Design a protein around this ligand. Sequence first.
Ligand SMILES: [Mg+2]
Ligand SMILES: [Mg+2]
Ligand SMILES: [Mg+2]
Ligand SMILES: [Mg+2]
Ligand SMILES: [Mg+2]
Ligand SMILES: [Mg+2]
Ligand SMILES: [Mg+2]
Ligand SMILES: [Mg+2]
Ligand SMILES: [Mg+2]
Lengths: 51, 82, 119, 67
Amino acid sequence: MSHNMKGQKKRLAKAHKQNTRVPVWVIVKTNRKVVSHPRRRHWRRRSLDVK
Amino acid sequence: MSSINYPFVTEKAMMLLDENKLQFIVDTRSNKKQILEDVEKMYGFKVKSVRTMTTMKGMKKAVLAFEEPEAAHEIATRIGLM
Amino acid sequence: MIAMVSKQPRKQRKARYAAPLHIRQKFMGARLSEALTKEYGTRSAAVITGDTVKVMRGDFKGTEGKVQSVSLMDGTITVDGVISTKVDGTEVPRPLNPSNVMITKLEMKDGRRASSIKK
Amino acid sequence: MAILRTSEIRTMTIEERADELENLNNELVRERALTSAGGAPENPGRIGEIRRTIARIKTIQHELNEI
RNA sequence: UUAUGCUAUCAGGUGGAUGGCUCGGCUCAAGAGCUUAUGAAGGACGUGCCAAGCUGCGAUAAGCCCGGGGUAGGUGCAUGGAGCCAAUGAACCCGGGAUUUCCGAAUGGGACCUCUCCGUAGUGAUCAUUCAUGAUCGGGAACGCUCCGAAUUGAAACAUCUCAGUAGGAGCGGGAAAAGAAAUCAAUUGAGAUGCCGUAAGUAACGGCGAGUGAAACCGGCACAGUUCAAACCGAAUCCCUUCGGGGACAUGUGGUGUUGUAGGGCUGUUCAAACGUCUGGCGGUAAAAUCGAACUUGCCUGGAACGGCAGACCAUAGAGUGUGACAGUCACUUAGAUGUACGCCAAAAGACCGGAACAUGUCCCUGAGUACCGUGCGUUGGAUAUCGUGCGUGAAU
RNA sequence: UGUUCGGGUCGAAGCAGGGCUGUGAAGUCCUGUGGACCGUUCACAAACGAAAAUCCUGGUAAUAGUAGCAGCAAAGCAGGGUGAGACUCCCUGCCGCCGAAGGGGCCAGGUUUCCUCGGCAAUGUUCGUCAGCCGAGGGUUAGUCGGUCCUAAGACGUACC
Ligand SMILES: [Mg+2]
Ligand SMILES: [Mg+2]
Ligand SMILES: [Mg+2]
Ligand SMILES: [Mg+2]
Ligand SMILES: [Mg+2]
Ligand SMILES: [Mg+2]
Ligand SMILES: [Mg+2]
Ligand SMILES: [Mg+2]
Ligand SMILES: [Mg+2]
């Protein structure tokens, strides 16, 4: 099941945390000028090269 | 360095408190001995054992089992979890 | 202080846009009334919350009032009386520019204010 | 003003400074514990003020050779 | 009410051209120019009340402390909610400190394991000494020095030649580097260290004498500066470390004299006396954020709003420019012209320090070796029997 | 760009359509839109004029409501619910498929796809109230299971050259 070390799991946790919708108050404050970031992906697509 | 950040207060952590246990979020670069000594100095309760977990958010949870009964209840009372 | 070697529009607008926040206090400058200028010797001054201004340009030529707030980053002040209404109806302050106002009553509470005005 | 200024931190004794440090750490632990359960804090300026005050106290101790 | 259609114009959709604007780019000029074992550049992970990215920062984590400048607000790109901080002088700017996870020159051992093992808490490798201690390692846009080194292409094919000592590689290295005080260039008799620019000149020279390659000296400028060892004579008279007790180097030579060609120096005798340079000194200059800096916001018209039109009043050692509800010398910041400045740097008077310049005398003594030259092979060069290098062999005088 | 004379919020550039002038390159004026800049005399410059390069970039037609949504596993029907909306989501009954693989255990690989609640613009070869989709929250506990330990093929480091 892909036995991982500590560092690999750490990087996987970070790449997980980056999949987030931009906060609503950011969109309110910037006046609909920020609506996305380049860190969004999906698990069944291009594999991440984190490991 | 400080190894205890704050108690963890989800629904699962509340039920552990029934049979005299807590669940802290500890510093991810620490082992069981350091956790033991920090908690013992900070509350003066003789810990019995300790179980550790690494979560997918990054942090590191630790479950402390105390020897003296009713200790976890009053620790959670003074800490403010209650 | 940016000498005559800054005659390029790009440089001037860079200087005014990305300014240190202690230089943006200077852009809050407004003319003084006759008595103020002839008793302090400075032709102008800076606008600070708590002083009475007289609007000189725009839709409210001649209306007076206190300064209700100042924002350094925006570069605009807020004045009593000068308001705008919402569609549902709610009076709101309308921002102005300190170069369209005249100072008639200074608000002396800092103690350092007199030295700050001149020298 | 602040939870403590530098004058009061430098004026106190060693044990007084240490005790203030433990009080601040305990209050920070409680504040984080409450906020960790997805709740709007009763006063969400406390965390920043507390951390900055603790930074002041540790800086003062390290300057006075206390630690 | 002739359907499905054809041509032209109009209204709307889609789309994002044109115009106007622009905190961006590019080129030239003037400055300034090293940093790291006291742990760099770069990377991973973390850090915000609501926080995903970038930016900053490091478990003291969009930050802490001190001094100055600045004055009423602050909470990055990014004016949302709720809070906090600030007259005990914040935010911001200039200078100086503190904390500074793990990897990384990475350096106690080990890495398809940015973590892990023993903890004997860790001087990894190579070096110098008096063996206390000290030095090197990595990075840097291009520039710099040494060594190794192609082919396409041109010759209307192609091999010498050319492309070209170019592209590329290895080593070393600073704010610059390299060179540098004639065993020189000249021509009849002269010049007087080096570098860089101009010219000589597409000339001399090389070459299937084809295509092509290709200098220097004289002369004009920028800038100027000369010296130190080895030996002859004396023989420890010298140097360094230090707990100030002492210890190491050194007769296989520390130190003094001496440094050159119409020869010089030493030995021997006379004379004149002290030029260049090192140190202390800080008169006086340069010098952070920064401070001051003239004169309209006057009347009527248009307009949502005057910096505009028509009238009137002023400034100028300031009519460069930007902002402001439309075109601004007089509204704001500026400008011309003046003041101020900690840490540093430069430096004039004035004192102390080693001391230098000539002459006369000679079977007197000293002046850089596998070097200079030469034979032979190859590379390179404009270098031609007359460039430089260096493999082998041979090889002087004083 | 240098220089001379000007226009513009009582409406500049640009755009759509028209009138007149010139052999022509083109100029000027009118109407609608637009909301801030644009010319001219004498000269000088150039990153200076496009219909074509199986040209480059962007937008968009016909083909066309067409092919495909069959071939190796032809699978659904009745009754009752939920819901604005039901061939397609849920329960019961009947009828079916694999049954030495389409079941169970797990390596490498994936990296939150796992569980609950709330949604249906897009994703799903149709619809959808459903979902491996979208939003919020939660979940992995070891002296005995593995790694860690030993060495094989064979690597790497320091020294010597
Ligand atoms: Mg040829
Ligand atoms: Mg180096
Ligand atoms: Mg030399
Ligand atoms: Mg050549
Ligand atoms: Mg001016
Ligand atoms: Mg075309
Ligand atoms: Mg069967
Ligand atoms: Mg669908
Ligand atoms: Mg475990």
